[PDB]
Amino acid sequence: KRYFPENLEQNQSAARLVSAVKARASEADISSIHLAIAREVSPMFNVHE
Amino acid sequence: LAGANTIIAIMRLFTPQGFLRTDDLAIAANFPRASRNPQTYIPYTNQRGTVTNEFASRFRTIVATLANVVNERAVQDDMQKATRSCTKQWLRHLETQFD
Amino acid sequence: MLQQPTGGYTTLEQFAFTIRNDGTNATPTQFLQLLSYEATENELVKKTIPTPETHLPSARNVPGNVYIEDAITQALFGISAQNVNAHGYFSRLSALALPNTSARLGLDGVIYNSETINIPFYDPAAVANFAATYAKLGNASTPRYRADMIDIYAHVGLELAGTDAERAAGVMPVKRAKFDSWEGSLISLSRDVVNWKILAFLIDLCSLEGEALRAFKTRNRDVFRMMLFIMSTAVAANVVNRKVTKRVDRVLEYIGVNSMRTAGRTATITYDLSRHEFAAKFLQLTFTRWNA
Amino acid sequence: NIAVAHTDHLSVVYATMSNFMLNFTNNFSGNHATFKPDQYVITSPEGSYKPIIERQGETVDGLTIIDTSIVWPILCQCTYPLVRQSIMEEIVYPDPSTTLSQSLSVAQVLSKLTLPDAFINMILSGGDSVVMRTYQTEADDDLDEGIRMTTYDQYLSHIRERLHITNVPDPIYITGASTPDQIAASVQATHVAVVLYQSGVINGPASTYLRENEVLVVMPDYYDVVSRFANANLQMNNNRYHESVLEIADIFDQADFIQTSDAVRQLRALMPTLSTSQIRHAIERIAQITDVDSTDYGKLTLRFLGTLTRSLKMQNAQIRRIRPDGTVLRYDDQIDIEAFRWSRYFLDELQLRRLSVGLRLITNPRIARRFNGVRIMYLTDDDPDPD
Amino acid sequence: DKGALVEADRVIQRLIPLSSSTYVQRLAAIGALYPNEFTENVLDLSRLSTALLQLSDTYYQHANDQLRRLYRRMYNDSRTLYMTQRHQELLLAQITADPNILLYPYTYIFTTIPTSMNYISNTGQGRIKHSLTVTGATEHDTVADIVLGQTGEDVITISMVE
DSSP: OOOSOTTTTTOSTTHHHHHHHHHHOOOOOHHHHHHHHHTTTSOOOSOOO | OOSOHHHHHHHGGGOOOSEEEEOHHHHHHTOOOSSSSOEEEESOOOOOSSSOOHHHHHHHHHHHHHHHHHHTOOOSSHHHHHHHHHHHHHHHHHHHHHO | OBOOOSSOGGGSGGGOOOEEETTEEEOHHHHHTTOEEEOOSOEEEOOOOOOOOSOOOOOOOOOSOEEHHHHHHHHHHOSSOOOTTTSOGGGGHHHHHSTTOSOEEBTTSEEESSOOTTOOBBOHHHHHHHHHHHGGGGGSSSGGGOOOSSTHHHHHHHHHTOOHHHHHHTEEEOOEEEEEOOTTHHHHHHHHHHTSOHHHHHHHHHHOOHHHHHHHHHHTHHHHHHHHHHHHHHHOSEEEEEEOSSOEEEEEEOTTOOOOOOSOBTTBOOOOHHHHHHHHHHHHHHHHHHOO | OTHHIIIIIIHHHHHHHHHOTTOOSOOOOSOTTTOOOOOEEEEETTEEEEESSOOOOOOTTTTTSOOGGGHHHHHHSOOOTTOOOOOOOOOOOOOHHHHHHHHHHHHHHHHHHHHHHHHHHHHTTTOOEEEEEEEOOSTTOOSSOSEEEEEHHHIIIIIHHHHHHHTOOOOOEEOSOOOHHHHHHHHHHHSSOEEEEOSSOBOHHHHHHHHHTTOEEEESOOTTGGGGBOOTTOOOOTTOEEEEEEEGGGTOOOTTTSOOOHHHHHHHHHSOOOOHHHHHHHHHHHHHHHOOOOOHHHHHHHHHTOOOOOOOOOTTOOOEEBOTTSOBOOOOTTTSOGGGSOOGGGOOHHHHHHHHHHHHHHTOTTTOOOOOOOOOOOOOOSSOOOO | OOOOOOOOSOSOOOOOOSSOOHHHHHHHHHHHTOOBOOOOSOOOGGGHHHHHHHHHHHHTTTSOHHHHHHHHHHHHOTTSEEEEHHHHHHHHHHHHHOTTOOOOOOEEEESSOOOOOOBOOOOSSOOOOOOOOSOOSOOOSSOOOOOOOOOOTTTOOOOSOO
């Protein structure tokens, strides 16, 4: 993962921001990504939420 | 809008950066297509420049706006002041990663 | 000894001053023809130049044959001269200043301590006339004798950019110079000028009198202006290029203004503060001789 | 007791240490009420700026954490040479050469450190570019001829920061009341053929000027472009244009800022399309080539400096003060030092002077020995000649 | 200008900004133009800088284009000491008297004292009570409506009867 600049992850005053980015940074999964890209073109029948 | 300009200007950060391709190959194949003028919005064009890449540059202006906005964010807590600073660094970092 | 003609030494084809340009050895006047100007709101009023100090610096006891022409030319237009006041060898000119001195000034621009075989030299009376003033380049460093390095540049601009009307008036808008330009035009110009035998032009400036001198000032005004141009690029606050329909116009801004800049740039030769003092002194002496 | 050893003996050490080569920044004016350190950044037009000074959380092996308790041992359990009670220990005056030699070692290691990246960035400095429609305004216009123009967003994204660096007044807006002379004035004032459209419609002579001088108009949008002009020819049309790339080198030509020698130009023409990762790989390769072992203290400073990640985007990078408010200021004679006015691509003056002659080598015809294109033809080889 | 004898130490009491920020250059430029009318009213000396900066902000805001360009020249050559011809005449007098005297060299004499109205300046307390005249030099062919922003009662009250 390359979410943070070097040192900023281990910086003590950054911990709120780092906790936040960790709260949003889902682990990469080929199925989820391939789907995320593929779905951009695929027809949608049930409205997405 | 007359007085929501920071809001509108941030909303422009959402404007899509690609183009509306016509589905010429599929119209040629007589593939099924419910629209009478088939089209799909491709997310981004390829880099016609030799070095500059329009997409990374747009994200540069986006992170520029967002860092200016994080910086213009007043807070009470000391820790909120701290993260207000650290987020600007993280923004700048995402900018390079996106490039 | 080379005799001095009824004109100056400059009348000899051996001493002709030319800058390379568009594949040929162009005369300075036909470079200055390329020059065009942009007036700005700022104005330049020339004040009277203070008279040069009476006092001639002593030459020290120097055994060698000091290379005074290379020293002066590199001090003014040199691409990488520095600390020009440190060695203090310009004072050596004073050795020439005396009546019946045993020293001679070579056409090479070397000051020999005695006459030597197979080395041609300027007529000693004329050289005494030249040394009698220009040895004062020797005191460019010494605090009691320093030239102004701001106001004098007004005169530079006036003698460069100035129209005959602006010149008679003694005031001109602070003009911004420009010319159609080849790559590195200013450096190559500065190096064409560094090879100039300026001692010839100065000797004729200091020794010629009356009608011959006035004819000299008219004949050599463009050469003078060329040196002034190189110096003005040395002091110019900035030197940009401008794209213009498959052409590039070099632009220096501004003429007549000394920015006193010391940090170097690739565009032009740069003056260490010592070079600023030296150039100011040189301009004082030279403009003083040029207006009489 | 210790007051003498401070006022009379530490004060000198603070003064000589004040003079050392590496203590380059000012530290404190001594007035707590209004002190603020000057804050330079390495700004880039093509990236976010890097402050020299920030709370980066690199504590430097714990150095940046301050134990005030150090006053207790200092006052109350440490002897000083100046306070004997009286042995009269002789004072030590350290050899300058040690601290001098480590200072110098750090310096040379630093220049040689920057060098490979700084070279490539100079080669590609003209390579940043803006997309540009060229609408044609004549019956027989070539695809290049016409009225050059670019979207305002491209202009902010590239041209503007470079104007701020070149320190020229911002280009005029053109309200359609504009004379060609006003435009000529702005162009010669900002040394760049760029003007910002504000309100229509631009008149005939102004159009002939923008076309003939190839001045680049900057539109807010392309929403109805021809309505923004006044074509007496009725030649101009919203569908009639040619989009194309405009290298920054084809706009700017400031000497130490944007390398633009025709040599470097054609050398770029030889290059493949590049990513920032490609450029980074090139820089790493030149680094891999030119690596040379340093003096041992220089190897120590290199090891202590940490991994050379170099996340910084250095395309046309400068050194500018930022306001505490965070805006990056234009260079100011009267405040900023002359050395910061141009990076000079971060090279030594001699590397520039040599670079010149090298550009002269590269474009020598005798070297140009990569040949382009072949003719297949069925012929006898009677009396062969390469030519 | 009133011709009275002056025992002051120097003819030009204004500072020359040898090196300064923008605000100083503009303060000096507007300062050398002598816009202010003579005023015996006590000033609030404390707010002075702000006042003068506002004056630059007004002088540049409403001067004819040549005056405007003159202030811009002044703002660019800040190291110059601009001065009226009479001032320089006084300097030539004191140099003629005491040749050894040093004087700041980089001056620009005014061949013309600029033609502009003097600005009123009373920074002391007291509301003005203008006695407006029905007609004047200006001809307003068509003026935009002026909307007076509403007043607090803290700044002014309006009782039913005096």
